Each structure stands twice: as C-alpha cells, then as structure tokens.
Amino acid sequence: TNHEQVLTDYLAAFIEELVQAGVKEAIISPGSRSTPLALMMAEHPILKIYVDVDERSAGFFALGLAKASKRPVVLLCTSGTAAANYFPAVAEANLSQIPLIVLTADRPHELRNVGAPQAMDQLHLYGSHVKDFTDMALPENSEEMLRYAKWHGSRAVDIAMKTPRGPVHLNFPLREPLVPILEPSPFTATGKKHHHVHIYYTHEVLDDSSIQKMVTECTGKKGVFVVGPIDKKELEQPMVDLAKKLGWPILADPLSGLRSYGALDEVVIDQYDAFLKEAEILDKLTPEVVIRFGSMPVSKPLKNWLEQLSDIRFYVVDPGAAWKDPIKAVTDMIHCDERFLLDIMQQNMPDDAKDAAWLSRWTSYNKVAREIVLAEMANTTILEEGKIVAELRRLLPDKAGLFIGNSMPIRDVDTYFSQIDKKIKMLANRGANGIDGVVSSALGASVVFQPMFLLIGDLSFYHDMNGLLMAKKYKMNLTIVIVNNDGGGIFSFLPQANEPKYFESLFGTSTELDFRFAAAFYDADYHEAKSVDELEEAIDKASYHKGLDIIEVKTNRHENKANHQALWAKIADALKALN
C-alpha cells in the first residue's frame, strides 16, 4: 500500500531487466524528480554509475562510451530543460547508430501542462531521432504492472541494440514522495526471483539466389571497395583478404580501421582524397563495380568522383535498411550482415579472375602520393596541422584509441594518416558532424580503449570544456592535442574567405583564450608545443601521466590553404607524368 514500496517494486523490476539485458553503465544527471530512479541505480551492485552535472556533456559521454564499448548505455536526467540538453547527443546517436537508452523523469499527469515548476512536455521529446518512445505508467506494484515494467526494460534494450541500432527514449512520470526503500536491498536476490527475457543472436543473410547473382555480376569486373566510417568489429582482415583475392583496391576512410589494423597491405588506398582531384588521372581509374561499406567517407573529392560515375554497378551494403546514400547512386542494395557478405564472396568468387593492371593502377598513385606526403612532413620544422597528424601517427602506441574532432582534424587525418602497422581504434562523431561534445565523447571512449588520445581544433575544445570536469571527477586518462588556430580554420578553404568585410566576425571566430588557464581549472598537465621535439616530449610525459594532459599547438589559419594547395600540386604534378 505504501507508495514508497510501490515505487520501489516498480523501478526495481525495470532496472534489473536493463542490467540483465546488457546495460553495464548509467550516466546520471542530478535532479529531484529523477531521485527514485537514480537512487535505485546506485543500489544496484553490478551497475557502474558516472555522474555528470552538465546534461549536454553527460549525453556525449554516454555516446562515446557506447560508441567504443559497443554496448547499451543508460542516460538518466531530471525533468525540465535537462532532457532538452540530451537532444544533440540523441541526434548523433540516431545518425551514427549508437544504442542509448534515454530515461527522463517527469511530473505526474496532474502536474503536466498546468504551469507546474520545472515541468515541460516531454512527450515525443526527441521526435524522429529515437527509434521508440514510451511514456511509462505511474508506478504500480500489481502483478501485470511489475511484468509490464520488466517487459519494457527488455524491449528498450532490444530495440536499441537491433540493427540498425539507435537511441530509445523512456519517460517516467513520478509522483511524490520520491524516496524509495533501499534497505532491505531491492535486488541482491533478497526475495523474489527475476524473469529475464533472453534475446537470441540473429543476423540477416543473403538468399542463395541472390548469392549466385552477386557472385556472377562481380566476377572479373574491374571493381572497387569504398569503406567509410564502419564500426562492426573484426571486419578489417576479411575485407583485406577479399580485396586481395579479387585484385581490387579499397578506398578506406580513417574511421574504417583499415589504415591502422595492425598490419600493412597493398589493397588499402589512403590517398584517394589527394589524387581524385586531378582530372588527367581519373580516366585510367574508371571502375565497373563499386561496393560501398558503412557510411559516406569524409572525402569530398571522392564523393564527387563517385557521383559522376555513369554505367556502373553500385552495390551498397546497408544492413538494417538505413538508406544512407547522399549521391543517390545505388544500383544494387544489399540488406545483410557485412560479415556474411565478405565470407560468402571469399568462398564463391573466382580466385583466377584478376586483372593485375587494375590494382597496380590504384596502388601506384597511392604509394607515390603517400610518400610525397610523408616526405614534405618529414622535412618540415613548422608544426603545421599536417605535421601534427604525421607526428601523432609515428608517436602513438599500439593498441591506442584516437578520437578525432570534426572540422579540420578529421580532414587532416584523411590527408596525413597513411596506413600504419599499429592497431589504432579511431573514433569520430560522424553522424551530424557536430563540433559539440567531442571532449565528452572522447572521455567516454577512454573508459574502453587506453591509452586514449583526442585531436581537436580550438573552437570544438571550447564548445565542450565542461566535459573535462568528468576527467577531474573520475580521474580519467586522456591526452588532448588542441590545434589552436584561433577560430574556424575550415572556413578559409570555402569561397566565403575571399570577401574579408564580414569574415572573421562570422566564419573564423577569433577567440583569444589562453587555454593554459582552462587546464589549471580542470587540474590538467598542460604543455605547449612550438617545435617538433617539444611535442615529442609532451606525448612522452603524457604516457607516464595516468590523468588528463592537454597539449596546445598554435597554428596560423591563413597559411593552411597555401600548405595544402602546395602539397596537393606536388602530388598532382608527380602523378600526372607517371606512365
């Protein structure tokens, strides 16, 4: 009868089901309405909790932790504008297919839409950016209601985790009193037995008729793989193996894993962004079959090349039917597991069909472009942005995670990160390509991969400085390389940089913050790199420090276009006279 007991039984059934369905970490924000749910998550012995007071930074922290661990992560906040702060992470979880279980407390029906304090319409709050929305019942400890609480915990994880993965949103109207009964413990097998809903491991498969068609239309064709941002693990070697058994180049995004899976290989192309610009070379590269994996790669020239390819079989491997194809060039859509596709083609495609002139065409351009790029970077003392990427490529340990901010860092890794023989798990928020939350994302990922590193421009670092409070609070290890060009450097390349009247105020926002002060605020070892060996020293000192390190490299925004154009011409001119 006690409302506190009814409140306890209800939430205990929901949270226990969540944990047993695979949720191991809950990112909680402080509130009064969320009191019963947050207290019960604490009383769980198996669930790990991270408290973050900024609801925006909390969301991207769950985002990155779920990105890196591949497991479901619970967010929990109070009612009011707190839930609204989750919206940027939710939008990026949706586009980037991350399983977040968004729990938001709310006022009960009597305090809804009546002008009550700290109460807003939380119904369908995130719209189409969640896979499912549920407005839970007011707590009841009835038999059917305890089974309904458990039923929803199982449902929520399963939908979040089901291909294509994405965020899920449960709203909890909660009436006062809000203090549950934590003694005796609501869990710990201290009474009733749970009824966990086991979900079985299922995956999509190509039909045997479709397998034979796929194999037939791809035999002996001059083919090309395009692997953009991918996530499904252990697909690096199988892809390389199938590429070698056909004689096909893989144009590989940095976020594919292929530029850093632990070995060197000939099929991976990492300088396509460099040479797909030169028209006099494009004629010898024309394919007959493209097979895209994962998301669209970062490279704009590659996109414009794929766009203008006529008379071609353009396969797109989209498990879960997300229809991510911004050039709208698809000719054959394959709705099945990527693991399965690589495997049934490895065992069915002919090993004999190999035009060696085809792969030799691609690899030649690449090996030459790659070493002209590594040359100009090896013979420079100016710590320009290309050099930073170069030097991080050399200095990073094996088994090291690298989070990359959007804007210019993500593009420079494309140009200046050729393939290395280290396993370097690479992460980037590439759903909406937002500069918000990259600090909090890299922090959550640092829960999973260590050593963790973050390359990030200055504006994005300011945008999410509050994430660093988590590093201070939880004693996390992250090594942030801030490329401080004082503004938005990416805008110097776009055509708005010609007219200087309204520039700088708009694009390229001079900020003039001494990030030394921000590092003392969050108790971070701060280093400023001026030379090449200055940076070497810092990465080195950062390897002994189990904690937050921040390494600033001041660069000039207005020279970046010149160095990039000068280098691309050296690659274009070389490749232009290469037959």
Ligand X SMILES: Cc1ncc(C[n+]2c([C@@H](O)CCC(=O)O)sc(CCOP(=O)(O)OP(=O)(O)O)c2C)c(N)n1
Q: Considering only residues 500 through 539, tell me which ones interact with ligand X, judged by CB under 6 A.
A: none
Q: 161 vs 483, which CB is nearer to ligand X?
A: 483
Contact by Cβ (8 Å): 485, 512: no
Verify binding: residue 366, Mg ion, rule CB under 5 A: no
Binding part of the chain for a second copy, among 102-110, 350-358, 360-368, 413-421 by CB under 8 A, reads: 102-110
- Among residues 3, 48, 213, 561, the one that binds a second copy under rule CB under 8 A: 213
User: How many whole angstroms separate alpha carbon 533 and alpha carbon 518?
Assistant: 24
User: How many whole angstroms separate alpha carbon 411 and alpha carbon 12?
Assistant: 47
- Among residues 42, 69, 70, 118, the one that binds ligand X under rule CB under 6 A: 118
User: How many whole angstroms separate alpha carbon 90 and alpha carbon 122?
Assistant: 14
Q: 198 vs 379, which CB is nearer to a second copy?
A: 198
Contact by Cβ (8 Å): 455, 481: yes
User: Packing angle between helix 236-244 and helix 338-346, nearest 10 degrees?
Assistant: 30
Q: At closest approach, how far in Å is the CB of 98 from Mg ion?
A: 25
**What does each C-alpha distance from 529 to 11, 64, 307, 466 come to in angstroms?**
51, 27, 41, 24
Verify binding: residue 444, ligand X, rule CB under 6 A: no
For residue 172, give the nearest of 107, 128, 247 by alpha carbon: 107
Q: At closest approach, how far in Å is the CB of 300 from Mg ion?
A: 19
Q: 483 vs 548, which CB is nearer to ligand X?
A: 483
Q: At closest approach, how far in Å is the CB of 71 from ligand X?
A: 26
Q: At closest approach, how far in Å is the CB of 204 from a second copy?
A: 5
**How crowded is residue 528: how many other Cβ atoms within 10 Å of its Cβ?**
18
Binding string, residues 450-469; x marks residues near Mg ion by CB under 5 A? -------xx-----------
Tokens representing 55 are 């609801």
Verify binding: residue 419, ligand X, rule CB under 6 A: no
Verify binding: residue 407, ligand X, rule CB under 6 A: yes
Binding part of the chain for a second copy, among 85-93, 526-534, 535-543, 553-561 by CB under 8 A, reads: 85-93
Contact by Cβ (8 Å): 63, 98: yes
User: How many whole angstroms separate alpha carbon 362 and alpha carbon 249?
Assistant: 7
Tokens representing 32 are 């009064």
366 makes contact, choosing from ligand X, a second copy, Mg ion, none, with CB < 5 to 8 Å by partner type, with none
Verify binding: residue 436, ligand X, rule CB under 6 A: yes
User: How many whole angstroms separate alpha carbon 479 and alpha carbon 551?
Assistant: 7
Verify binding: residue 408, ligand X, rule CB under 6 A: yes
Q: Could you tell me where the DSSP H helices lie in 464-531?
A: 468-474, 515-521
Write out the binding residues for Mg(2+). Answer: 42, 458, 485, 487
Verify binding: residue 428, ligand X, rule CB under 6 A: no
527: helix, coil or strand?
A: strand
Q: 60 vs 449, which CB is nearer to a second copy?
A: 60
Residue type, 235: L
Write out the binding residues for thiamine diphosphate. Answer: 407-408, 433, 435, 459-460, 485, 489-490
Quickly list DSSP for 346-361. HTTS-SS---HHHHHH
Verify binding: residue 81, ligand X, rule CB under 6 A: yes
Verify binding: residue 495, a second copy, rule CB under 8 A: yes
- Name the phi and psi angles at 462, rounded to 5: -65, -40
- Chain centre to alpha carbon of residue 86: 16
Contact by Cβ (8 Å): 235, 389: no
Q: At closest approach, how far in Å is the CB of 305 from a second copy?
A: 15
User: How many whole angstroms separate alpha carbon 465 and alpha carbon 53?
Assistant: 13
495 makes contact, choosing from ligand X, Mg ion, a second copy, none, with CB < 5 to 8 Å by partner type, with a second copy
Tokens representing 263 are 């070995």
Verify binding: residue 180, ligand X, rule CB under 6 A: no
Q: Considering only residues 121 through 150, tell me which ones interact with a second copy, judged by CB under 8 A.
A: 121, 123-125, 127-129, 134-138, 144-145, 147-148, 150
Tokens representing 175 are 């009436």
- Among residues 73, 490, 550, 551, the one that binds ligand X under rule CB under 6 A: 490
Residue type, 15: I
Verify binding: residue 555, Mg ion, rule CB under 5 A: no
Verify binding: residue 205, a second copy, rule CB under 8 A: yes
For residue 334, give the nearest of 157, 215, 228 by alpha carbon: 215
Verify binding: residue 457, ligand X, rule CB under 6 A: yes
Verify binding: residue 492, Mg ion, rule CB under 5 A: no
Contacting residues toward ligand X, per CB under 6 A: 30-32, 55, 78, 80-82, 117-118, 405-408, 410, 433-436, 457-460, 483, 485, 488-490
Contacting residues toward Mg ion, per CB under 5 A: 457-458, 485, 489
